[PDB]
Design a protein around this ligand. Sequence first.
Ligand SMILES: CC(C)CN1CCc2cc(O)ccc2[C@@]1(C)c1ccc(/C=C/C(=O)O)cc1
Ligand SMILES: CC(C)CN1CCc2cc(O)ccc2[C@@]1(C)c1ccc(/C=C/C(=O)O)cc1
Lengths: 233, 233
Amino acid sequence: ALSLTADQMVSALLDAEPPILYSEYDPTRPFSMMGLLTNLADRELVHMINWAKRVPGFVDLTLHDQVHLLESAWLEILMIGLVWRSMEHPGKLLFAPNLLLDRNQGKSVEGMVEIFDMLLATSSRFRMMNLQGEEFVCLKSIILLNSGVYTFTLKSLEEKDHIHRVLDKITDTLIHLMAKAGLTLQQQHQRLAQLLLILSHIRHMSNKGMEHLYSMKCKNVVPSYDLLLEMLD
Amino acid sequence: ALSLTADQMVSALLDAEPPILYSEYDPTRPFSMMGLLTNLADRELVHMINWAKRVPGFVDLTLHDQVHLLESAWLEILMIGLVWRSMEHPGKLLFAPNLLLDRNQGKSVEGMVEIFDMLLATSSRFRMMNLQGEEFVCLKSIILLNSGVYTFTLKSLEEKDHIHRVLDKITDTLIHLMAKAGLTLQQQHQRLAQLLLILSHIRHMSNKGMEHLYSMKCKNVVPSYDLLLEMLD
Ligand SMILES: CC(C)CN1CCc2cc(O)ccc2[C@@]1(C)c1ccc(/C=C/C(=O)O)cc1
Ligand SMILES: CC(C)CN1CCc2cc(O)ccc2[C@@]1(C)c1ccc(/C=C/C(=O)O)cc1
């Protein structure tokens, strides 16, 4: 994991990529948006667990630390996947290939249009930077590893140290991709920063979305510790 | 602003630095924690406005964009200042030189100890990285410029472009500082990433803290648009 080259890191991440899922609704019936979106998110989470298990370094950690990292990152990870899928659909969010929604469609649930707008703006930003696939898979792994690493014993100290070393390797990998594409050393550092700074915004979006979900006050919304632990164990 | 050298950027930021304020309580009287903390934050905000006005590039923007950026960033900026002040006080938060508080003192307000713990962990992280003063002032300017830039006309497009160019200059400046301290090119990129990734955590802390403040349901808590506009105008 720490012994991987940049090219091997990129290949491993590209190979771990989850599939694009479809919404479950009968397309022959007239057109619950939140029901459809929740069911989709539920099914995505299962594939997210399998993906996480394939990110180099992640299964080197304890089970309890894997659960903590996923608990902190899951909504950010769904969000960055959505934004990526939506990049070539200006003004629309591609929740699934059969569920491409605009901001006006978001207005049907109190509080949702604000979150829709933020996600659309992030997609616009990705389009302006011309984000590449190989850069995207790196960023998504950085989110997994970083989002919970500040909120966790000798074992904990070793785990945090390992997470930081894996993150360094992903940083090396990003810069290598940018070097391969022909950017100058200045451009490399500038773009690295531009990418990492978007991750703060993805965090913000996730916090706003978690507030929405918690506000539903429902046991069948937001995956519990125990459900994540059961799927990861 | 865009014509500044790295060294001139660092000098301008170091010169803009606000003062360290004191809590207002009679030290001869027996020991309201939230009252003291709110009064301190109120007075800090005034100095924050003056600081912001001295960050290169910031007064090149429209008044409405300056207000938006401050509205998005103010709590992150107070938080990164607190964490910096607290760096050489393991297990304590130096809200002011006469108000140095531990996690047990946070437990006196429902919900506060969790936020205290996060801030202490960030201080610990800064101590482990050995963050320098010159790096800190850069990060604080990046927060000002970046936090609201994804949530904003031809003028808006020009403003966002300018913000991104100033952010590039701050990135150049960081790397120059790291080059001046003798780090290799690898170490430079690795540390740049490590620093920027902590900014996601500061965002998260701020969202958690904003949720606390809004939950108070009080007109004399959280600065309004109009108050920020009045102070900035
Ligand atoms: C308000 C946000 C939490 C809505 N998010 C936006 C990001 C996103 C990305 C997806 O790829 C699929 C769905 C979503 C939704 C629409 C969403 C996320 C989670 C849930 C509920 C999950 C649960 O209750 O366990 C519902 C909608
Ligand atoms: C719950 C958090 C919002 C508490 N924060 C933590 C960061 C911080 C940094 C300071 O340097 C000074 C105070 C604080 C406090 C304790 C804080 C921040 C804002 C307010 C209220 C501001 C307002 O009501 O306008 C109260 C406490």
